[PDB]
Design an enzyme around this catalytic site. Structure first.
Site, PDB file in Angstrom:
ATOM      1  N   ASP A   7      13.811  -1.084   4.906  1.00  0.00           N
ATOM      2  CA  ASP A   7      12.975   0.088   5.184  1.00  0.00           C
ATOM      3  C   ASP A   7      13.612   1.151   6.103  1.00  0.00           C
ATOM      4  O   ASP A   7      12.904   2.022   6.660  1.00  0.00           O
ATOM      5  CB  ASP A   7      11.585  -0.295   5.753  1.00  0.00           C
ATOM      6  N   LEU A   8      14.927   1.148   6.245  1.00  0.00           N
ATOM      7  CA  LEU A   8      15.549   2.155   7.065  1.00  0.00           C
ATOM      8  C   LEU A   8      15.179   3.571   6.502  1.00  0.00           C
ATOM      9  O   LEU A   8      15.290   3.818   5.332  1.00  0.00           O
ATOM     10  CB  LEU A   8      17.059   2.002   7.081  1.00  0.00           C
ATOM     11  N   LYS A  42      10.199  -4.820  11.824  1.00  0.00           N
ATOM     12  CA  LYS A  42       9.304  -5.972  11.959  1.00  0.00           C
ATOM     13  C   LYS A  42       9.705  -7.093  11.003  1.00  0.00           C
ATOM     14  O   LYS A  42      10.542  -6.894  10.107  1.00  0.00           O
ATOM     15  CB  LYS A  42       7.881  -5.541  11.690  1.00  0.00           C
ATOM     16  N   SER A  49       0.824  -1.214   0.000  1.00  0.00           N
ATOM     17  CA  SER A  49       0.000   0.000   0.000  1.00  0.00           C
ATOM     18  C   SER A  49       0.838   1.236   0.000  1.00  0.00           C
ATOM     19  O   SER A  49       0.309   2.315  -0.156  1.00  0.00           O
ATOM     20  CB  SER A  49      -0.907  -0.014   1.208  1.00  0.00           C
TER      21      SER A  49
HETATM   22  N1  LIG Z   1      14.560  -4.625  -1.810  1.00  0.00           N
HETATM   23  C1  LIG Z   1      13.603  -5.462  -2.226  1.00  0.00           C
HETATM   24  N2  LIG Z   1      13.865  -6.443  -3.152  1.00  0.00           N
HETATM   25  C2  LIG Z   1      12.904  -7.302  -3.575  1.00  0.00           C
HETATM   26  N3  LIG Z   1      11.654  -7.222  -3.142  1.00  0.00           N
HETATM   27  C3  LIG Z   1      11.282  -6.314  -2.226  1.00  0.00           C
HETATM   28  C4  LIG Z   1      12.243  -5.338  -1.721  1.00  0.00           C
HETATM   29  N4  LIG Z   1      11.583  -4.522  -0.874  1.00  0.00           N
HETATM   30  C5  LIG Z   1      10.302  -4.962  -0.826  1.00  0.00           C
HETATM   31  N5  LIG Z   1      10.140  -6.017  -1.655  1.00  0.00           N
HETATM   32  C6  LIG Z   1       8.897  -6.774  -1.883  1.00  0.00           C
HETATM   33  O1  LIG Z   1       7.897  -5.999  -2.539  1.00  0.00           O
HETATM   34  C7  LIG Z   1       6.632  -6.372  -1.966  1.00  0.00           C
HETATM   35  C8  LIG Z   1       5.955  -5.133  -1.437  1.00  0.00           C
HETATM   36  O2  LIG Z   1       6.851  -4.620  -0.477  1.00  0.00           O
HETATM   37  P1  LIG Z   1       6.249  -4.184   0.957  1.00  0.00           P
HETATM   38  O3  LIG Z   1       7.388  -3.598   1.768  1.00  0.00           O
HETATM   39  O4  LIG Z   1       5.259  -5.242   1.408  1.00  0.00           O
HETATM   40  O5  LIG Z   1       5.354  -2.928   0.420  1.00  0.00           O
HETATM   41  P2  LIG Z   1       4.994  -1.606   1.269  1.00  0.00           P
HETATM   42  O6  LIG Z   1       3.942  -0.910   0.382  1.00  0.00           O
HETATM   43  O7  LIG Z   1       6.191  -0.800   1.683  1.00  0.00           O
HETATM   44  N6  LIG Z   1       4.435  -1.890   2.879  1.00  0.00           N
HETATM   45  P3  LIG Z   1       2.817  -2.430   3.149  1.00  0.00           P
HETATM   46  O8  LIG Z   1       1.907  -1.362   2.682  1.00  0.00           O
HETATM   47  O9  LIG Z   1       2.957  -2.509   4.667  1.00  0.00           O
HETATM   48  O10 LIG Z   1       2.824  -3.721   2.369  1.00  0.00           O
HETATM   49  C9  LIG Z   1       6.876  -7.334  -0.828  1.00  0.00           C
HETATM   50  O11 LIG Z   1       6.652  -8.635  -1.286  1.00  0.00           O
HETATM   51  C10 LIG Z   1       8.330  -7.206  -0.512  1.00  0.00           C
HETATM   52  O12 LIG Z   1       8.905  -8.425  -0.089  1.00  0.00           O
END
Ligand SMILES: Nc1ncnc2c1ncn2[C@@H]1O[C@H](COP(=O)(O)OP(=O)(O)NP(=O)(O)O)[C@@H](O)[C@H]1O
Length: 277
Positions: A163-164, A146, A26
């Protein structure tokens, strides 16, 4: 094919974007990208919110400058960030290390339980990374630790904290005042305070998640019930499902309601549970 269609680029031509969507949440959409200078693949992330105020974007620009000069093998590397113009609004792009093996959370879903040797090793690496961040000048506090943003390089590899530096921007996103994930947030964070010990609290809950394979406070009906419980010192129910007493005892010291009574990271590292082997 897919790798021959570079549909975006950083101004310098260093980073390229391919139309390969590797995940979405999101806050962020993640695409596979390429670092043309080193030839390594990277994660090219695009923020969903295209209506951040000028002031939010400015503050994040300053944040990304600091993030771009930090590096540690247990922290997901942050390469760069800029604002692209897509359609009618300023889309923020972040480029980070590509993590190919998912998170602790997906590891727990796959293997069901974590062996105690694997727990010890990964918790120790999280602690080294936090300890690095806490000992910079000035200190960097993560604030949003987390299991969902702790990545692995493989099922028998190493952990990197993700996410730092994004907690301020995640809060701004859709102007929703999201402060963090209730399950991992220390009691003082609802009064708009934080210190290094919020990361110790969150580490404690990560450890609880890894030891029990369940989300903390999953018994609670909503985030309001979590807030009421945490700010009166009522532990998550899963705390009593912790099977290794040394583990239980570490978690206890990390999630104390009074921040001043929590373990220090140095205390944690010298604990017999971690110091052994
Ligand atoms: N550096 C990365 N390399 C590969 N995949 C990643 C990386 N960062 C995030 N992802 C993947 O991309 C997808 C979405 O990331 P995520 O951090 O869940 O989204 P978000 O919008 O920041 N947080 P939320 O709204 O809480 O889901 C997840 O499956 C993560 O595992």
């Amino acid at each position: 094919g897919a790798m021959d269609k570079a549909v975006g680029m950083s101004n310098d031509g260093r980073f390229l974007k391919f139309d390969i969507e590797i995940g979405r949440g999101s806050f962020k959409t993640v695409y596979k990208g390429l670092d043309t200078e080193t030839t390594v693949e990277v994660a090219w992330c695009e923020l969903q919110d295209r209506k951040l105020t000028k002031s939010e974007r400015q503050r994040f620009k300053e944040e990304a400058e600091m993030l771009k000069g930090l590096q540690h093998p247990n922290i997901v590397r942050f390469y760069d960030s800029w604002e692209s113009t897509v359609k009618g609004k300023k889309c923020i792009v972040l480029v980070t290390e590509l993590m190919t093996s998912g998170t602790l959370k997906t590891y727990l879903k796959r293997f069901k339980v974590m062996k105690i040797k694997v727990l010890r090793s990964w918790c120790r690496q999280i602690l080294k990374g936090l300890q690095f961040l806490h000992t910079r000048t000035p200190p960097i506090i993560h604030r949003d630790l987390k299991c969902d943003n702790i990545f692995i390089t493989g099922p028998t590899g190493s952990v990197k904290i993700g996410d730092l530096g994004l907690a301020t921007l995640k809060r701004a996103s859709f102007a929703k005042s999201v402060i963090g994930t209730p399950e991992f947030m220390a009691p003082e964070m609802y009064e708009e305070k934080y210190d290094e010990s919020v990361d110790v609290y969150a580490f404690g809950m990560c450890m609880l998640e890894m030891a029990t394979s369940e989300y903390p406070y999953s018994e609670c009906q909503n985030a309001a019930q979590i807030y009421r419980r945490v700010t009166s010192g009522v532990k998550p129910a899963s705390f009593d499902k912790v099977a290794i007493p040394e583990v239980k005892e570490i978690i206890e010291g990390c999630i104390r309601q009074n921040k001043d009574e929590r373990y220090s990271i140095k205390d944690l590292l010298n604990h017999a549970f971690f110091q052994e082997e």
